[model samples]
Target: RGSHMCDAFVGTWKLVSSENFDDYMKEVGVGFATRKVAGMAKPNMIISVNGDVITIKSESTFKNTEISFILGQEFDEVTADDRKVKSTITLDGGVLVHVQKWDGKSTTIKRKREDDKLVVECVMKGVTSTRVYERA
Candidate 1:
């Protein structure tokens, strides 16, 4: 049951394309130089699960980041660009929904598999971005 959903996402994925990421970054208060660097970096995400704990390792030319969380558990998260927030990741059907709240603001990210690619939708401050990743 839960294992099936976890197994489906237990693999390595490479970023292939993205849309409106710049606006999303701006909305999140990322500086121009950082956003410029982020725009050029293609990251690889490696996912693994053990029992109820899921670990995500994100690697890129610019930086590498990792996070591990239990389902439905809220924890502190320091984002890639150094934003501190409280976050929770929950699996709904086949989608992994992540909610992060910081300084009275929030960002929601939904990730799901579409065809042969992983699709990620991020929304913050009324700005949205779509990121696509292919299995690697």
Candidate 2:
């Protein structure tokens, strides 16, 4: 057994589908070219958990970003668009809550397993995007 419930996320996952990604990207001021590239990119996530440390590797044709942080610890993260922010992740029940703070604004990303799918919901500047992934 694992020490934390979030260990359930420790695995490889492939993006199966996404919703409202364009709108969310627009809200974040992503340029049209980048948004177009993002739309065409199929991202995959490889999550690894050891004790209280978590590493999330996000891969895509456009770009790849990876970060490792201890649960409940804050760390600086540079987003795919190169935005710098303070980021952290915490477990709430079976959900992994990820928050990124920058420019006095923040985005909340929630990851949870529903049935056989890994559902990631992102909310930023009133725009919401949900991406579904499957185990690889």
Candidate 3:
């Protein structure tokens, strides 16, 4: 009875686009060098769902990261890129939304599967970026 209930995100997907890629990284405090490389790097999200828990892995040749948490949970000290991040994910109108309460910086990431691609939106104070992905 839980069809369309989180089973669709059970694989690896690659990033394709960000509606406003550069600006989002700028707001996120990602250093110039990091963003320079990231802006061009093809990113990917490897997700696995076990019950209500969701594990996400964002990978790139320059940077590889992973985060695992249950839906609606708020947890801290989860490390990525050598920094601490307090994060959580919630179902927003059937879309998987990520809220990252980072150390001194935070942002929200929205992900949706459209046709054969994944669209992601990262939002902050005055910036919002949409990143698209293809299954890899």
Best candidate according to lDDT: 1
- Give the TM-score of each candidate: 0.95, 0.93, 0.85
Local lDDT at 1 for model 2: 50
RMSD of each: 1.5, 1.4, 2.3
Query: Residue-wise lDDT of candidate 3 within 9-97, one digit each (tens)?
Result: 77889876667877887787778787777777787789888766778888887678777788888876443334567777888776888
Tens-place lDDT per residue, model 1, 1-136, is 2555667788999999999999999998899999999889999999888887889899998789999999899988888898999999999988999999998989999989899888999998679999999999
Clashes of each: 0, 0, 4
Off by more than 4 A, model 2 = 1-3
How do these models rank on lDDT, best leading? 1, 2, 3
- Kindly give the stretch of ten consecutive residues in candidate 3 with the minimal lDDT sum: 75-84
Candidate 2 per-residue lDDT over residues 2-44, each given as its tens digit: 4767767889999999999999888877799988988888899
Candidate 2 contains a number of clashing pairs equal to 0
lDDT of model 3 at residue 116? 83
CA shift of 13, model 1, Å: 0.5
TM-score of 1: 0.95
Best by TM-score: 1
Colliding pairs, model 1: none
lDDT of each: 0.91, 0.89, 0.77
